[PDB]
Design a binder for this molecule. Structure first.
Ligand SMILES: Nc1ncnc2c1ncn2[C@@H]1O[C@H](COP(=O)(O)OP(=O)(O)O)[C@@H](O)[C@H]1O
Ligand SMILES: Nc1ncnc2c1ncn2[C@@H]1O[C@H](COP(=O)(O)OP(=O)(O)O)[C@@H](O)[C@H]1O
Ligand SMILES: [Ca+2]
Ligand SMILES: [Ca+2]
Lengths: 375, 232, 375
């Protein structure tokens, strides 16, 4: 546009595909990372079904679709279907050719080595990308919120990651990975829903569970005191008319499921709560470096949007943590797009040149170019 | 965002302090440079800048999340502040400063490499609005940092006495022979035909665009005089 | 400042870098002689780490730093890092160019010959010093306290030195050197701390041990009588809230470690106590020159600040020393800066001209100019 040339920003997860044009502050066309076929055989003739039904077109009509998700936190059940997800991204919504503008993707911390080389194969050899990089999830948001000294816990629907990044990344481990977010809460509901004459059976309607979840479901401050309150039918049940037509008086259902977050013992996992793992990462660093970590805590992700998420942390942490200085948690009121706001940062930096992979660089160091320069 | 102007300074030194035209108190041992300042060369001198401001002074960018709510009103003043959407300057509205400044400077260049320009310089006399007073130190400096006398020597080439061919021809016509309308055309062979009939070395003069090149001053006084003791 | 020209005072040790402006009575900007890198790899991009983290900036944040000390009492583990310690001294705090004002450094008594020539190489050839001298630790303090006839024992964290200087220096030996001070007490604590569920593991937090030490730890007058007192939980344990948050009830821990001072047998050294070595130096001098030495004893250094340090000396000395005249020890209530107060003296003397090394003097007598004129 008579400014520069070849530039773009992108970001994908287990919820939405955040992307936009060149030099933007916020996304432009986010869409669900879904994709399925036809369990209904799509009037076979009222088109040769194909196109699994990805994008707004897919999210619109769920019934015909057997929504089979490709990338469940880390593991990619299949790469063949990924081919026609990015074919919908750059060409339909972004309206730009990938054989021109760079690309800034996100990296699920500690992702299988074999996956990186596989992805690069899809871009460089097929979609011809002469410049691109895959930054590491959390570290991005750090520079956006305006923090240089804090501990980041960025996670939404993908995977939980405790990234203590306030003066260095890639160093002692002090990081954790937990497959317990988003889809885990989306699949657990139908189970407990059975006791209330409800059952979102198939995957298509399972996706709706998440929709209603993010508009009412809240977290209990103390399950004990709210157990006796159950008698008082006022703060619990609330009339929610299902778009089709079937009221669901969610009440105790709201604060029962989220309890699993702090208590992973409800789904057969010894994984400690997100406030225990926090200790595990802090106890590794030096002794004279905790007082500043407690001062500011970066809690990001769409998972940190439900009522009663930050106040609970300040109750459990103080217990098994030093009690002398003040403790404050920085949870950006809109901390979901924290990664994208940070993506816009690195997207406009020139120092970033010493990170991405140039067309020729791949052929000069084989497929291992990724893990030979990056880390 | 968190990085202050002070930290920005350190981001320059590490990246450079080797590429010409950039110094500091750390590398260049010069007490004149403060502990919170830096050196930067331009044309012919040195300038030490401060760090105050920079941040809010630079970015200044404005997004459309603060304008939308205001331009939705109904008043020739309120919406008036925002003329009929995009006065031939938009293309893409939301961009983090940096680039926005590049536009104001790029739009300036793009319209310079496609036109026939003309140049005019000016020199301020003094700081008292006097049409007959010279501030020695101030004047000499003004002529230096502009690099005008270097544009005199270098452009031509770099020496003493210089005269234009276009103006040398239609001036020294009535001196030698064979320099009449029966000329050949070339400005080199013709001159050789001129200087050979009066015994003058050829290497002393050379031909280029429109400037005669005879090195050393004495030759000028030698030419002018020679044109006097044999023709009043 | 329209007074004189080219003048300054400095002093370094194993604790603080004492320095100031021209013609000062007390220091102006003291800072820890530390320096390290990043065991955390400093957000590599949230600056090209480098600057080991020396000065207040280093002491502020200890966690990221792997504090590796350069000059342990006498031996310099490495000179390459010393380069960017003095680059922080003259230019940042002192705000003066070393290519103008002289410099008065201190000399660790009996320092390797090869070291003197190495230091001079860093000043004259690189930092261009046309005038400087390196006076000998103890002798300086003598002229400050206002004593001409006494025995000096100046030592803090560096090395212990018994300097009998009351009418002549550099003569019979009568001097001792003992690598048992400061850092020795700083490293010994973590060992014994293990028995009390505490352990300052790495070097970064090890530095804090010294901080708390100089605010409570005291010396036992008699370990025997204070052993039974242990039952009485009143004069021992004292609540000390660790800044972060971890109480440490130091009690018997306070007077156990300092006992090593008088008893070097707790760390595998046959080195006799500081009151025995005192005899060793006195027995060498004449017989009719002791009565005046006992009258006044110059005990200086930050090590002589702990409770129960002077009174103990008057108990052990009198035993194996002549018992007829009166014995008094002069321990300046603030005897740490005794060297600096004395530094201010020699810094304003003109006779000092016949001591320092002039720019040309170095080139006229080679690198041995130091040990050719000085001593
Ligand atoms: N205000 C909100 N309240 C509750 N859930 C929200 C909110 N905003 C976004 N979400 C949810 O957060 C999820 C996306 O979070 P994100 O951190 O981007 O996930 P991922 O990185 O795993 O793709 C989606 O399930 C979305 O519905
Ligand atoms: N009042 C005090 N009480 C206890 N320790 C002190 C006191 N003042 C200074 N110190 C300590 O003394 C040490 C510095 O003593 P100093 O004699 O200057 O050492 P050095 O000459 O080895 O550098 C530092 O460890 C400092 O914390
Ligand atoms: Ca993700
Ligand atoms: Ca010392």
């Amino acid at each position: 546009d008579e400014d520069e040339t070849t530039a773009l920003v992108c970001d994908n997860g287990s919820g939405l595909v955040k992307a936009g044009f060149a030099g933007d502050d916020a996304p432009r066309a986010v869409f669900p990372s879904i994709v399925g076929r036809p369990r209904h055989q799509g009037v076979m003739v009222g088109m040769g079904q194909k196109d699994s039904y990805v994008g707004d077109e897919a999210q619109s009509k769920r019934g015909i679709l057997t929504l089979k998700y490709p990338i469940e936190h880390g593991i990619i059940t299949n790469w063949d279907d990924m081919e026609k997800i990015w074919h919908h991204t750059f060409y339909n919504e972004l309206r730009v050719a990938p054989e021109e503008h760079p690309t800034l993707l996100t990296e699920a911390p500690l992702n299988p080595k074999a996956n990186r080389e596989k992805m690069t194969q899809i871009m460089f050899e097929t979609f011809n990308v002469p410049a691109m990089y895959v930054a590491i999830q959390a570290v991005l948001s750090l520079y956006a919120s305006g923090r240089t000294t804090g501990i980041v816990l960025d996670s939404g629907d993908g995977v939980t990651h405790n990234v203590p990044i306030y003066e260095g990344y890639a160093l002692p481990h002090a990081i954790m990975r937990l497959d317990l977010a988003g889809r885990d809460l989306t699949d657990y509901l139908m189970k407990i829903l059975t006791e209330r004459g409800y059952s979102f059976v198939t995957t298509a309607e399972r996706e709706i569970v998440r929709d209603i979840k993010e508009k009412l479901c809240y977290v209990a401050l103390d399950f004990e005191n709210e157990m006796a309150t159950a008698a008082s039918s006022s703060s619990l049940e609330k009339s929610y008319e299902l778009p089709d037509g079937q009221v669901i008086t969610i009440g105790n259902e709201r604060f029962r499921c989220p309890e699993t977050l702090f208590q992973p013992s409800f789904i057969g996992m010894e994984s400690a709560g997100i406030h225990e793992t926090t200790y595990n990462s802090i106890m590794k660093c030096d002794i004279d470096i905790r007082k500043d970590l407690y001062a500011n805590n970066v809690m990001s992700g769409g998972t940190t949007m439900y009522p009663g998420i930050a106040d609970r942390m300040q109750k459990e942490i103080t217990a098994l943590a030093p009690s002398t200085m003040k403790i404050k948690i920085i949870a950006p009121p809109e901390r979901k797009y924290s990664v994208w706001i940070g993506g816009s940062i690195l997207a406009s930096l020139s120092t970033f040149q010493q990170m991405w992979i140039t067309k020729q660089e791949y052929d000069e160091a084989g497929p291992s170019i990724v893990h030979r320069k990056c880390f | 965002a968190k990085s202050t102007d002070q930290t920005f300074l350190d981001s320059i030194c590490k990246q450079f302090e080797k590429n010409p035209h950039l110094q500091s108190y750390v590398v260049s041992k010069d007490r004149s440079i403060g502990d919170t300042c830096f050196r930067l060369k331009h044309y012919a001198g040195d300038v030490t800048y401060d760090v105050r401001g920079f941040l809010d002074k630079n970015k200044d960018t404005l997004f459309g999340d603060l304008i939308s709510s205001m331009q939705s009103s109904s008043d020739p003043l309120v919406q008036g502040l925002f003329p009929p959407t995009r006065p031939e300057d938009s293309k893409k509205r939301p961009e983090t400063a940096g680039s926005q400044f590049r536009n104001a400077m790029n739009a300036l260049i793009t319209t310079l490499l496609a036109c026939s320009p003309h140049y005019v310089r000016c020199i301020k006399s003094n700081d008292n609005k006097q049409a007959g007073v010279i501030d020695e130190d101030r004047v000499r400096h003004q002529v230096r940092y502009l690099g005008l006398l270097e544009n005199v020597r270098v452009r031509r080439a770099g020496f003493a006495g210089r005269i234009e061919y276009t103006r040398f021809y239609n001036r020294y016509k009535m001196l030698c022979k064979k320099t009449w309308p029966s000329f050949n055309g070339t400005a080199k062979q013709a001159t050789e035909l001129i200087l050979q009939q009066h015994n003058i070395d050829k290497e002393e003069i050379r031909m280029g665009k429109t400037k005669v090149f005879i090195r050393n001053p004495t030759t000028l006084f030698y030419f002018e005089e020679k044109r006097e003791l044999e023709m009043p």
